[PDB]
């Protein structure tokens, strides 16, 4: 016979070894496949899909969760006051947990790329006004007033002209540190002008926030989530 | 020597593994083969052969089984009355158990294709009349009267003209469900006209039913039968 | 290393396995061969050689075995009487055991082919007469008289003309059955004429029988003999 | 299966065997590399770098080690007297231990090649004088006076002209013997002239010694050092 | 993995198996070789070298062994008398044990070829005379007198003309038999003429015997000797 020498690692079962096992049923011809639309090949295909951000994730909402899907604007708000704010942390807890992206991020250890957040205005066709959207880069001081936010990366959104507007988070990474000191970029929504509306129209309307990863987004190192029990 | 690593599955005996064993008698030259007509290569060759259906499988027959091989028609029967009925269930119990097809179906788990049932009339050459053969598609209501059966897939058979006629079950599948709700297609034989005969001829004749699978018939997943003990 | 899986049959020693073992003395160069006439390659070469049949295997011979090598003819014998008889059963007990062929047949399980038996006459050059040799095919009734033997396959041998004559058993097979019913072909030697001799010559002479397998003879399935102890 | 025979050495783990093991994480794509200047490929690249010799390794220095990095010359010294002396023994204890070369030599068993020692003069730009550097070949008597040293391989160094001078140890080997009798080449620094200086300049200056292996230097047979604990 | 089957001989260590083992030090580059004159490739190179035969191996010599290296001739010896005698048995005990050939023969089991024995005369340049050398073939009667030896293979050696002469043993083999009956060829040295010498020259001189195997000499089957303890 052929002189062989068993080397270390013989007889071991590695749950990640990718070998070939004996077919239990050699004579069986599995039912052949047909065409089913919507086949997915890579999870990133799913991450590029906009899902709803629960920006309005208040403790008082928990019992009427349907209200977390959108936040509001109103006439009472004065020009220049802060409307809402949240950071762009897909993996971490918070608004992003509701998105398909943030849920899949938990299934991985590292990730990086651009993100795009879309804002949709639902109020009466008769309403008009301007909101100021601002992205404060990582390791930056959250804007104090409307005027400072304006000096940074921002977008004046006139919902009297566009019912929707999209912002792009240029770049994110994620590093675990703990037992803080970390801080990723911060989106802040400001009232540039107050909410203007004629007689006969609701004086309180809602904004819906959707988000998704762009093409350059990628992830590595799998790890089962902690989202279930 | 050659560095090898034994992988999981070493030393196991799989009754379905298809390996090569050492020839017990290496010097032996087995007697060479000759030509024997009728070599069979695939069981389906056998399934395409018409065998006799025991349509007349009555509890009162059991002691004189030879009578199950054929059912009868007579003068007493009135025009339009139901003569016989059975479904096209090769694998299941019933008339099909007598056929070579139904016996081989038990040796498998799944099957599908077309079937063809042939009816032969044995009565006196002097007899004439018309029988109506009808196939009621799967999940269909068995014909109530001759007239409704006529509206479905049917064949007016005049045994005064043709001593034999063949019907084709377009398509069958089989799904186990149980402990009903399943129902495959139903062949129904009706008296279109009464049995006509002159003086001197038997007033009771018999029909013989033969059946076989067509070419598109196929089976998969072997399993030892329950027909023996 | 190379992923391998030990299959059933590992570690077994099959006395008929034909493998390769490690040379006990790798540096040794065995004495080279020279030419020795008479090299044998196949046992059948030996079977084609005529050896002496002990046709005269009487219980009264055992103490003077040299007499089994030949039987006799004499003047006392009357025209038409049976001289000797034996069957063509190489493997079985009897006259054939003395031949090299019958001895080698015991070393095998099956065999078939033609055989040739030669008869040699040793008496005085002055003697003359005719003997009738007859082969009675397998499953045939042994000749009752000279006349019937003559109607079957036979040879009129005039030892006044030929000192030797050869007969050919067309075909033999062998089937074990037992604990008869089997019977292979039967050679019968008859006196066609009486033994004629002048004054001065011995009135009793001997015939020697030699036999061998022809070219079409072959054997299969080895098995140690029962000839030794 | 394939007939194999396990040979001696099966199941052994040799700490120096260079095999291939199963990748613990087959789906992982390690972060790709980028360019980092200063990649090292062979330790000899480091050995060709001049490092400081602690020629002034006195027992009285130990508490002010910074003084071992350089030895001195002064006016008090008379023409012809010995300034310093040490041998060219990279691996062994002594001045060479401070060099990167001598430290790496301990990580090996054998070595051989040329070495180059550089001497740098740090005193006032106004000082002048001549030092005599001499290499006494292996198995040679260390020079007794300046005059004999001059007859051997030497270099008259005028630090009034050159602030630095380099000497080349032609060849070294190393052989362990012990429990001496071994002796490698000996560098001796002599005062050819006394230290000359004008009014206003320090009357004591220092020499710094740097050394490195040349290109032909090579080492073999690794062995963990004894420099740590 | 690859289906393999361990065959008999697995896990065995055969001291003569010629396999490949793992290099204990894979990174080590052994010191390279240089040219050393006198490399030997085959032991037969050594066997072709003449070494001194201890023909004069007397029991009385043992305490002054230097005398075994040569035997003598003298004036007292009468014309025709036997001078010395020994056989050509390299492997066996006796004179041949002193030769390099006989010592190496013990390291083997079989051998065969030609041998050549050289005789050298050391006496005074003034001496003359003739010696008769005779080889008595294996299985031959040792010569009784000078005259019979002369009739066989012989050489008349006149040491007044040639100071040396060489004899060739045409062929030897060796067969162990024992617990004689064996006998290989016998060299016999005779005095053809007496030793002649003038006044002033020694009346006793010595002959030195050297022997070696020729080119056709070869050996097979190694076996450790019995020459040491």
XYZ file of N, CA, C and O in Angstrom, chain E residues 28-152:
500
model
N 17.439 24.510 9.103
C 18.883 24.305 9.086
C 19.448 23.948 7.712
O 18.897 23.099 7.010
N 20.534 24.617 7.324
C 21.218 24.355 6.055
C 22.573 23.789 6.451
O 23.484 24.537 6.815
N 22.722 22.455 6.369
C 23.947 21.732 6.722
C 25.147 22.317 6.034
O 25.062 22.758 4.889
N 26.268 22.331 6.739
C 27.488 22.869 6.171
C 27.727 22.169 4.837
O 27.645 20.952 4.754
N 28.003 22.932 3.769
C 28.244 22.333 2.452
C 29.567 21.566 2.381
O 30.526 21.890 3.084
N 29.636 20.545 1.518
C 30.831 19.713 1.352
C 31.892 20.324 0.468
O 31.611 21.183 -0.355
N 33.118 19.862 0.645
C 34.225 20.343 -0.155
C 34.898 19.114 -0.729
O 34.446 17.988 -0.509
N 35.980 19.321 -1.462
C 36.647 18.184 -2.040
C 37.669 17.565 -1.132
O 38.568 18.236 -0.626
N 37.513 16.270 -0.925
C 38.445 15.539 -0.115
C 38.869 14.392 -1.003
O 38.046 13.588 -1.449
N 40.158 14.334 -1.329
C 40.632 13.249 -2.182
C 40.458 11.892 -1.527
O 40.389 11.780 -0.305
N 40.365 10.860 -2.349
C 40.223 9.526 -1.807
C 38.829 9.107 -1.389
O 38.689 8.279 -0.494
N 37.794 9.665 -2.007
C 36.448 9.238 -1.649
C 36.255 7.808 -2.157
O 36.666 7.475 -3.269
N 35.645 6.962 -1.334
C 35.385 5.584 -1.726
C 33.899 5.444 -1.998
O 33.057 5.996 -1.269
N 33.580 4.703 -3.051
C 32.198 4.493 -3.459
C 31.734 3.059 -3.267
O 30.568 2.820 -2.955
N 32.636 2.102 -3.469
C 32.300 0.690 -3.304
C 33.438 -0.056 -2.605
O 34.611 0.163 -2.903
N 33.088 -0.938 -1.673
C 34.091 -1.692 -0.938
C 35.052 -2.488 -1.812
O 36.193 -2.741 -1.418
N 34.598 -2.892 -2.996
C 35.450 -3.659 -3.902
C 36.681 -2.863 -4.313
O 37.682 -3.438 -4.715
N 36.605 -1.539 -4.213
C 37.746 -0.698 -4.561
C 38.870 -1.060 -3.587
O 40.038 -1.132 -3.957
N 38.491 -1.298 -2.338
C 39.441 -1.659 -1.301
C 39.958 -3.091 -1.467
O 41.126 -3.369 -1.189
N 39.092 -3.991 -1.918
C 39.463 -5.391 -2.108
C 40.465 -5.612 -3.223
O 41.099 -6.660 -3.282
N 40.588 -4.646 -4.125
C 41.508 -4.791 -5.241
C 42.904 -4.363 -4.833
O 43.830 -4.362 -5.646
N 43.049 -4.008 -3.562
C 44.328 -3.580 -3.034
C 45.070 -4.689 -2.311
O 44.556 -5.334 -1.386
N 46.300 -4.894 -2.754
C 47.156 -5.912 -2.192
C 47.487 -5.588 -0.739
O 47.882 -4.475 -0.404
N 47.291 -6.570 0.126
C 47.590 -6.440 1.542
C 48.471 -7.633 1.883
O 48.520 -8.607 1.135
N 49.178 -7.564 3.000
C 50.092 -8.639 3.361
C 49.461 -9.886 3.970
O 48.718 -9.810 4.950
N 49.776 -11.036 3.375
C 49.288 -12.332 3.842
C 50.217 -12.846 4.918
O 51.445 -12.795 4.759
N 49.639 -13.338 6.011
C 50.444 -13.899 7.088
C 50.597 -15.395 6.821
O 50.016 -16.229 7.518
N 51.374 -15.721 5.789
C 51.615 -17.106 5.404
C 52.377 -17.818 6.503
O 52.162 -19.003 6.751
N 53.267 -17.089 7.166
C 54.049 -17.663 8.251
C 53.316 -17.456 9.584
O 53.836 -16.809 10.495
N 52.106 -17.999 9.685
C 51.282 -17.882 10.893
C 51.489 -19.067 11.834
O 50.585 -19.882 12.012
N 52.671 -19.152 12.444
C 53.002 -20.255 13.349
C 52.577 -19.950 14.776
O 52.437 -18.777 15.142
N 52.366 -20.997 15.576
C 51.961 -20.828 16.972
C 53.105 -20.232 17.764
O 52.898 -19.596 18.795
N 54.316 -20.435 17.256
C 55.530 -19.941 17.894
C 55.823 -18.461 17.566
O 56.729 -17.851 18.138
N 55.033 -17.903 16.651
C 55.155 -16.517 16.190
C 54.374 -15.550 17.037
O 54.800 -14.420 17.242
N 53.210 -15.997 17.488
C 52.292 -15.183 18.267
C 52.890 -14.127 19.194
O 52.318 -13.048 19.354
N 54.045 -14.425 19.788
C 54.695 -13.489 20.706
C 55.651 -12.492 20.032
O 56.189 -11.598 20.688
N 55.843 -12.653 18.723
C 56.710 -11.806 17.891
C 56.040 -11.757 16.512
O 56.663 -12.039 15.495
N 54.760 -11.361 16.469
C 53.898 -11.259 15.284
C 54.513 -10.650 14.051
O 54.096 -10.943 12.933
N 55.498 -9.791 14.244
C 56.124 -9.168 13.096
C 56.735 -10.204 12.154
O 56.994 -9.910 10.991
N 56.939 -11.424 12.647
C 57.554 -12.475 11.839
C 56.573 -13.232 10.969
O 56.987 -14.050 10.140
N 55.284 -12.967 11.153
C 54.259 -13.657 10.381
C 54.115 -13.024 9.004
O 53.644 -13.664 8.057
N 54.559 -11.777 8.900
C 54.472 -11.022 7.654
C 55.357 -11.530 6.510
O 55.206 -11.114 5.356
N 56.256 -12.453 6.817
C 57.124 -12.995 5.793
C 57.734 -14.316 6.213
O 58.036 -14.515 7.389
N 57.904 -15.222 5.252
C 58.506 -16.521 5.521
C 59.900 -16.585 4.915
O 60.278 -15.737 4.112
N 60.686 -17.609 5.269
C 62.012 -17.578 4.662
C 62.454 -18.762 3.818
O 61.825 -19.830 3.800
N 63.578 -18.532 3.145
C 64.245 -19.509 2.296
C 65.690 -19.504 2.797
O 66.140 -18.507 3.368
N 66.412 -20.605 2.616
C 67.793 -20.655 3.089
C 68.638 -21.668 2.339
O 68.143 -22.415 1.481
N 69.919 -21.703 2.681
C 70.804 -22.615 2.001
C 70.595 -24.049 2.433
O 70.721 -24.958 1.612
N 70.255 -24.253 3.707
C 70.033 -25.605 4.232
C 68.993 -26.389 3.443
O 69.084 -27.614 3.335
N 67.992 -25.689 2.916
C 66.950 -26.345 2.141
C 67.534 -26.998 0.887
O 68.344 -26.400 0.171
N 67.108 -28.237 0.645
C 67.561 -29.038 -0.484
C 66.673 -28.844 -1.701
O 65.480 -28.566 -1.577
N 67.256 -28.987 -2.886
C 66.487 -28.798 -4.105
C 65.281 -29.724 -4.104
O 65.398 -30.905 -3.796
N 64.115 -29.170 -4.411
C 62.915 -29.979 -4.491
C 62.037 -30.086 -3.267
O 60.932 -30.646 -3.350
N 62.496 -29.562 -2.135
C 61.678 -29.669 -0.941
C 60.627 -28.573 -0.860
O 60.793 -27.497 -1.428
N 59.530 -28.881 -0.174
C 58.421 -27.949 -0.013
C 58.790 -26.796 0.918
O 59.268 -27.013 2.032
N 58.560 -25.570 0.456
C 58.880 -24.383 1.243
C 57.714 -23.946 2.111
O 57.842 -23.800 3.327
N 56.573 -23.727 1.475
C 55.387 -23.312 2.194
C 54.163 -23.740 1.425
O 54.245 -24.125 0.260
N 53.021 -23.674 2.092
C 51.768 -24.038 1.469
C 50.596 -23.487 2.270
O 50.633 -23.454 3.497
N 49.575 -23.035 1.552
C 48.370 -22.488 2.155
C 47.307 -22.507 1.075
O 47.642 -22.600 -0.102
N 46.033 -22.438 1.450
C 45.009 -22.429 0.421
C 44.461 -21.027 0.196
O 44.734 -20.119 0.980
N 43.715 -20.853 -0.894
C 43.132 -19.559 -1.265
C 41.710 -19.384 -0.718
O 40.750 -19.302 -1.481
N 41.599 -19.295 0.606
C 40.319 -19.168 1.298
C 40.069 -17.823 2.007
O 39.860 -17.788 3.217
N 40.046 -16.708 1.258
C 39.823 -15.377 1.833
C 38.968 -15.272 3.103
O 39.411 -14.755 4.137
N 37.739 -15.764 3.031
C 36.864 -15.668 4.185
C 37.257 -16.454 5.420
O 37.181 -15.946 6.534
N 37.681 -17.697 5.223
C 38.055 -18.564 6.332
C 39.280 -18.110 7.115
O 39.961 -17.150 6.743
N 39.533 -18.808 8.219
C 40.654 -18.517 9.098
C 41.962 -18.887 8.437
O 42.004 -19.669 7.490
N 43.041 -18.320 8.945
C 44.328 -18.623 8.371
C 45.047 -17.376 7.925
O 44.740 -16.271 8.376
N 46.010 -17.527 7.017
C 46.797 -16.411 6.497
C 45.978 -15.250 5.968
O 46.346 -14.093 6.164
N 44.864 -15.553 5.314
C 44.049 -14.501 4.731
C 43.402 -13.523 5.690
O 43.003 -12.432 5.291
N 43.312 -13.892 6.956
C 42.726 -13.011 7.946
C 43.472 -11.677 8.078
O 42.883 -10.670 8.476
N 44.760 -11.665 7.752
C 45.550 -10.444 7.885
C 45.306 -9.445 6.777
O 45.555 -8.248 6.951
N 44.815 -9.943 5.644
C 44.539 -9.110 4.479
C 43.257 -8.320 4.648
O 42.366 -8.714 5.398
N 43.166 -7.207 3.932
C 41.991 -6.354 3.990
C 40.837 -7.099 3.330
O 39.684 -6.939 3.723
N 41.160 -7.927 2.339
C 40.145 -8.700 1.625
C 39.444 -9.689 2.539
O 38.223 -9.685 2.643
N 40.222 -10.535 3.198
C 39.638 -11.519 4.085
C 38.805 -10.925 5.206
O 37.867 -11.562 5.684
N 39.151 -9.713 5.628
C 38.435 -9.035 6.707
C 37.075 -8.534 6.256
O 36.115 -8.500 7.034
N 37.012 -8.132 4.994
C 35.785 -7.624 4.421
C 34.888 -8.779 3.997
O 33.668 -8.635 3.939
N 35.484 -9.933 3.708
C 34.699 -11.098 3.305
C 33.820 -11.565 4.450
O 32.730 -12.092 4.235
N 34.297 -11.368 5.670
C 33.546 -11.772 6.846
C 32.290 -10.923 6.987
O 31.342 -11.323 7.667
N 32.289 -9.753 6.351
C 31.145 -8.845 6.401
C 30.063 -9.230 5.379
O 29.050 -8.538 5.249
N 30.272 -10.348 4.681
C 29.328 -10.847 3.675
C 29.119 -12.357 3.754
O 29.898 -13.067 4.398
N 28.067 -12.844 3.096
C 27.746 -14.269 3.113
C 28.251 -15.061 1.905
O 28.666 -16.208 2.038
N 28.205 -14.460 0.725
C 28.666 -15.139 -0.478
C 29.655 -14.275 -1.249
O 29.632 -13.046 -1.154
N 30.508 -14.923 -2.030
C 31.466 -14.211 -2.861
C 32.095 -15.112 -3.915
O 32.092 -16.336 -3.784
N 32.617 -14.497 -4.969
C 33.222 -15.248 -6.057
C 33.983 -14.344 -7.010
O 33.590 -13.198 -7.253
N 35.059 -14.884 -7.567
C 35.869 -14.135 -8.508
C 37.281 -14.675 -8.542
O 37.546 -15.755 -8.018
N 38.183 -13.928 -9.170
C 39.585 -14.316 -9.246
C 40.365 -13.562 -8.173
O 39.903 -12.552 -7.643
N 41.547 -14.066 -7.852
C 42.409 -13.447 -6.855
C 43.800 -13.426 -7.454
O 44.099 -14.187 -8.373
N 44.656 -12.549 -6.956
C 46.015 -12.536 -7.451
C 46.939 -12.416 -6.250
O 46.749 -11.574 -5.380
N 47.909 -13.318 -6.180
C 48.871 -13.331 -5.099
C 50.235 -12.954 -5.627
O 50.720 -13.521 -6.600
N 50.860 -11.996 -4.972
C 52.160 -11.534 -5.392
C 53.216 -11.943 -4.378
O 52.992 -11.857 -3.173
N 54.364 -12.398 -4.871
C 55.469 -12.809 -4.007
C 56.655 -11.888 -4.249
O 57.057 -11.664 -5.390
N 57.219 -11.359 -3.170
C 58.344 -10.442 -3.259
C 59.557 -11.038 -2.551
O 59.422 -11.539 -1.438
N 60.730 -10.997 -3.185
C 61.949 -11.542 -2.576
C 62.818 -10.398 -2.024
O 63.186 -9.487 -2.769
N 63.152 -10.465 -0.730
C 63.925 -9.421 -0.036
C 65.427 -9.614 0.150
O 66.142 -8.668 0.500
N 65.907 -10.821 -0.091
C 67.321 -11.098 0.076
C 68.317 -10.298 -0.747
O 67.961 -9.645 -1.729
N 69.578 -10.378 -0.322
C 70.715 -9.704 -0.955
C 70.666 -9.707 -2.464
O 70.256 -10.686 -3.083
N 71.103 -8.613 -3.068
C 71.099 -8.537 -4.512
C 71.984 -9.610 -5.141
O 71.852 -9.917 -6.322
N 72.890 -10.176 -4.353
C 73.811 -11.197 -4.849
C 73.246 -12.613 -4.904
O 73.877 -13.501 -5.475
N 72.074 -12.830 -4.311
C 71.469 -14.158 -4.289
C 70.710 -14.469 -5.567
O 70.204 -13.572 -6.230
N 70.641 -15.753 -5.900
C 69.937 -16.212 -7.088
C 69.390 -17.602 -6.775
O 69.751 -18.196 -5.761
N 68.516 -18.110 -7.636
C 67.926 -19.416 -7.417
C 66.530 -19.439 -7.996
O 66.013 -18.403 -8.408
N 65.909 -20.610 -8.034
C 64.568 -20.715 -8.584
C 63.601 -21.379 -7.622
O 63.913 -22.410 -7.028
N 62.424 -20.785 -7.478
C 61.376 -21.345 -6.632
C 60.264 -21.765 -7.589
O 60.099 -21.151 -8.637
N 59.516 -22.813 -7.258
C 58.414 -23.235 -8.123
C 57.102 -22.983 -7.382
O 56.900 -23.491 -6.281
N 56.230 -22.171 -7.977
C 54.933 -21.853 -7.379
C 53.909 -22.710 -8.106
O 53.926 -22.768 -9.335
N 53.011 -23.353 -7.366
C 52.013 -24.213 -7.992
C 50.619 -24.079 -7.395
O 50.454 -24.067 -6.177
N 49.621 -23.975 -8.270
C 48.229 -23.880 -7.831
C 47.558 -25.201 -8.142
O 47.519 -25.658 -9.295
N 47.045 -25.815 -7.092
C 46.365 -27.083 -7.210
C 44.882 -26.760 -7.156
O 44.372 -26.344 -6.125
N 44.175 -26.942 -8.279
C 42.743 -26.670 -8.411
C 41.889 -27.300 -7.321
O 42.258 -28.315 -6.746
N 40.722 -26.695 -7.026
C 39.816 -27.215 -5.992
C 39.433 -28.675 -6.216
O 39.137 -29.077 -7.338
N 39.449 -29.460 -5.142
C 39.127 -30.873 -5.250
C 40.261 -31.639 -5.910
O 40.045 -32.640 -6.597
N 41.481 -31.152 -5.710
C 42.647 -31.792 -6.286
C 43.589 -32.217 -5.182
O 43.588 -31.639 -4.091
N 44.398 -33.227 -5.464
C 45.343 -33.751 -4.483
C 46.551 -32.836 -4.390
O 47.197 -32.559 -5.399
N 46.853 -32.360 -3.186
C 48.013 -31.498 -3.006
C 49.262 -32.211 -3.554
O 49.479 -33.394 -3.286
N 50.090 -31.500 -4.338
C 51.298 -32.106 -4.902
C 52.126 -32.830 -3.846
O 52.311 -32.335 -2.733
N 52.626 -34.002 -4.206
C 53.427 -34.803 -3.295
C 54.922 -34.458 -3.351
O 55.602 -34.429 -2.328
N 55.421 -34.201 -4.558
C 56.824 -33.870 -4.778
C 56.911 -32.698 -5.750
O 55.891 -32.262 -6.291
N 58.115 -32.190 -5.986
C 58.246 -31.064 -6.905
C 57.795 -31.437 -8.311
O 57.091 -30.675 -8.971
N 58.210 -32.618 -8.754
C 57.891 -33.123 -10.089
C 56.398 -33.181 -10.432
O 56.022 -32.871 -11.563
N 55.544 -33.583 -9.489
C 54.106 -33.638 -9.776
C 53.544 -32.226 -9.831
O 52.739 -31.915 -10.705
N 53.974 -31.372 -8.902
C 53.513 -29.985 -8.864
C 53.781 -29.324 -10.209
O 52.976 -28.530 -10.698
N 54.920 -29.670 -10.801
C 55.347 -29.139 -12.090
C 54.385 -29.504 -13.222
O 54.256 -28.767 -14.204
N 53.712 -30.636 -13.080
C 52.785 -31.101 -14.100
C 51.454 -30.362 -14.055
O 50.664 -30.434 -14.994
N 51.219 -29.649 -12.960
C 49.986 -28.895 -12.822
C 50.238 -27.436 -13.123
O 51.299 -27.084 -13.628
